């Protein structure tokens, strides 16, 4: 049920200073979209990643979560890379 | 749009001697939908995974080095899994 999208946004949202709207801006996505994502992804792991007030902070959970969530995305890019080298 | 779902077929596929049935039997889902969604990767990245012959017939030489990074993927998933869980019950 863990989405690759999930993934994407909650780093990228870590990455806009915890803003959902400027990040929906810069995905060419709708706020709600990606609200309602990250709160699936929260509900299926039984952690929420940031603290809500507006986004106050990423919780100590959600440090860890999105470290790793970047990483999945480096590896992402990596098998685009071995496309790449084994094509045209 | 690549998607970890794709990850985790062609991972399975490789797995279970390239029989597609075999791993919709294993993951609970259709063959049809397996090979689809293999395909649908597979034009996204420009490259085959597997060889085919009407049957797929082994892993290609991209094949072998994006499975392995697939399973690296599943793995680091594994691990989100394993975060939520020691910090929701903490």
Redesign the interface.
């Known amino acids: 049920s863990?989405?690759?999208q999930q993934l994407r946004y909650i780093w990228e949202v870590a990455h806009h200073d915890l803003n959902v709207s400027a990040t929906a801006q810069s995905l060419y996505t709708s706020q709600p979209g990606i609200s309602k994502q990250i709160r699936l992804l929260e509900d299926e792991?039984?952690?929420e990643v940031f603290a809500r007030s507006h986004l106050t902070r990423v919780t100590?959970?959600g440090e860890?979560?999105i470290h790793?969530?970047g990483?999945?995305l480096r590896?992402?890019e990596?098998?685009?890379q071995?496309?790449?080298?084994?094509?045209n």
């Not at 071995?82 to 094509?87: V, Y």
């Open positions: 863990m989405k690759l792991l039984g952690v100590p959970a860890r979560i790793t969530a990483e999945i590896k992402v990596s098998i685009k071995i496309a790449q080298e084994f094509s």
